[PDB]
Paper text:
HG3.17 was evolved from HG3, a higher-activity mutant (S265T) of the in silico design HG2 that was engineered post-design to reduce the active-site conformational heterogeneity observed by molecular dynamics analysis of HG25. Over an evolutionary trajectory that yielded the HG3.3b, HG3.7, and HG3.14 intermediates, a total of 17 mutations were introduced into HG3 to produce HG3.17, resulting in a catalytic efficiency increase of approximately three orders of magnitude. To evaluate changes to the HG3 conformational ensemble along its evolutionary trajectory, we solved room-temperature (277 K) X-ray crystal structures of all HG-series Kemp eliminases, both in the presence and absence of bound 6NT.
In all enzymes except for HG3.17, the unbound state is never pre-organized for catalysis as both Trp44 and Met237 adopt conformations that would prevent productive binding of 6NT. From HG3 to HG3.14, the unbound state is never pre-organized for catalysis as both Trp44 and Met237 adopt conformations that would prevent the productive binding of the transition state. Use of our HG3 crystal structures with or without 6NT as the design template causes similar, but less severe, structural, and energetic effects. The use of this ensemble resulted in an improved structural model compared to the one obtained from the corresponding crystal structure that is however less structurally accurate and stable than the one obtained from the ensemble refinement. The better predictive ability of the HG3-derived ensembles prepared using crystallographic restraints likely results from their lower deviation from the HG4 crystal structure (≈0.4 Å), which we previously showed to be necessary for an ensemble to represent a physically valid model of the target protein fold. We expect that the structures reported here, especially those of HG4 and HG3, will be helpful to benchmark these future enzyme design protocols.
Author numbering:
A (entry chain B), B (entry chain A): 4 to 303
The structure:
């Protein structure tokens, strides 16, 4: 039974999953995504070291495959990250000239978004821009361009595909009392009041056992930044307890601006932290109790 | 225990496995490969749709990753397929001029091989070139260029990297009485007598329960073509019976020119036919009975 259908029935946009070409051609991933999920997200195939490994040499084969598969099968598509310090090729982090890096950043955004113009529901334009204390992370982009790199990236992205929702993304936004959570709210409010086109906050939710409950307060706080959308992104939960997963889903239902949830893979052995069996299907592609508890929660 | 260490002790070159970047960053695949396998073969990253999706414009991000991982961890590397009708961009298959397709084919081979010159033990230069009845498969290469496309491919390959072993590969070479088995032997003997540098036949061994016994007669028949090497490539066996797998390993051991065996993935859920559970590790990354039977067989 399909959690995407059930969550749409509750007024949300999607229940989604990260995937890529070799997932869709192995295992039972393609069948499960067709039946049970409404949106796909590139596991790796749109990050910077995958898509522009040297200057101007774009690698689009993998993303092309995912985009075509999604369209053929009637699924929504997300993408990102456009601007991110991890998985950043050395040729970008070596740049010290402000104008050069500004144009490199603008060209990377514009080329990716233009290739799939109109087909991508939402992009994470900037990711992991905050330190844990809430100050801005001192990446090459902050150090060289300055604080306006975030305004410039969103402005550039809006011009490239005016139809896409533009998100800022970060992790460790799972507790309301955490400084990072409050800082991103305060900065996003101030950017949007200055005209920066930030449509969404995406919360990359990687939880330990028992941390689902805290998202019931954190997600409302993120929503108070006033963005039209917020999302739960790349969700997984060590142990995959029903309680944790149901708490996260209910946080999504409780927050009007929360458009949906994306889990970080289908089956446990294909997780980046597989020994914590943190996903909704087991190594035999059977649904786990957490999957069934979500169905039951969404039916009510 | 490492099947690769054990097969090396019986005088063979490797026990290998197919993999790629997102396998190495998820599950337990990297740790099992480090401990137990001696060679890696790209699941997808070196095929034509991934490496030359528009004419003359090459994508190497995924393949570079695999080659660097392998070098860092002391593993042999295989590559392919260079010339293959599947996963073939439509810009190639719509060429109708013989000289243009020949140059396109030569440019694809030379670029890939030159980039990793000296780092790749063996290349599958041509794949799946035969029909089941033993005639040559009518691909764009055969139709536009003619049967000379296979000599041209290998000659070009030998010039691009003289240190690499050059292989032709095909499937359903698993029975000594099947027409396709004798047919590839016939043609390889004739090509080699004409000076075509075919160093190896790679037998893409995808078996159903009970077919391992036939490989004991088929692989020596393949070896009668006189190539320096033969190999078992992309091995998997529906049901993963110890008896089938041991029979395949013993065929390798019995054939002087068989240099090793490559299995088509690490764990069952990541197989292209996962429902047949055809690999040596299960969905929790535990070694299966077939793995332990291979260990015992290699120690006898």
């Amino acid at each position: 039974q399909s959690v995407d259908q059930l969550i749409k029935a509750r007024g949300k946009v999607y229940f989604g999953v990260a995937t890529d070409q070799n997932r869709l051609t192995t295992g039972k991933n393609a069948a499960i995504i067709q039946a049970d999920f409404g949106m796909v997200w590139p596991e790796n195939s749109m990050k910077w070291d995958a898509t522009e490994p040297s200057q101007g040499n774009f690698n689009f084969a993998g993303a092309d495959y995912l985009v075509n598969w999604a369209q053929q099968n009637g699924k929504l598509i997300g993408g990102g990250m456009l601007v991110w310090h991890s998985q950043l090729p050395s040729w970008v982090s070596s740049i010290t000239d402000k104008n050069t890096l500004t144009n490199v950043m603008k060209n990377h955004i514009t080329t990716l978004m233009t290739r799939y113009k109109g087909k991508i529901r939402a992009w994470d334009v900037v990711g992991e821009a905050f330190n844990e204390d809430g100050s801005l992370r001192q990446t090459v982009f902050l150090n060289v361009i300055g604080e306006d790199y975030i305004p410039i990236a969103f402005q550039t992205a809006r011009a490239a595909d005016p139809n896409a929702k533009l998100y800022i993304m970060d992790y460790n936004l799972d507790s309301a009392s955490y400084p990072k959570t409050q800082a991103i709210v305060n900065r996003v409010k101030q950017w949007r009041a200055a005209g920066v086109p930030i449509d969404g906050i995406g919360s990359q939710t990687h939880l330990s056992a028992g941390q689902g409950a805290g998202v019931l307060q954190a997600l409302p706080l993120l929503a108070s930044a006033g963005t039209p959308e917020v999302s739960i992104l790349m969700l997984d939960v060590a142990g995959a307890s029903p309680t944790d997963y149901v708490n996260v889903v209910n946080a999504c239902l409780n927050v009007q601006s929360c458009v949906g949830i994306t889990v970080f893979g289908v089956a446990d052995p294909d997780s980046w932290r597989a020994s914590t069996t943190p996903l909704l299907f087991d190594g035999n592609f059977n649904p786990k109790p957490a999957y069934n508890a979500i169905v039951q929660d969404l039916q009510q």
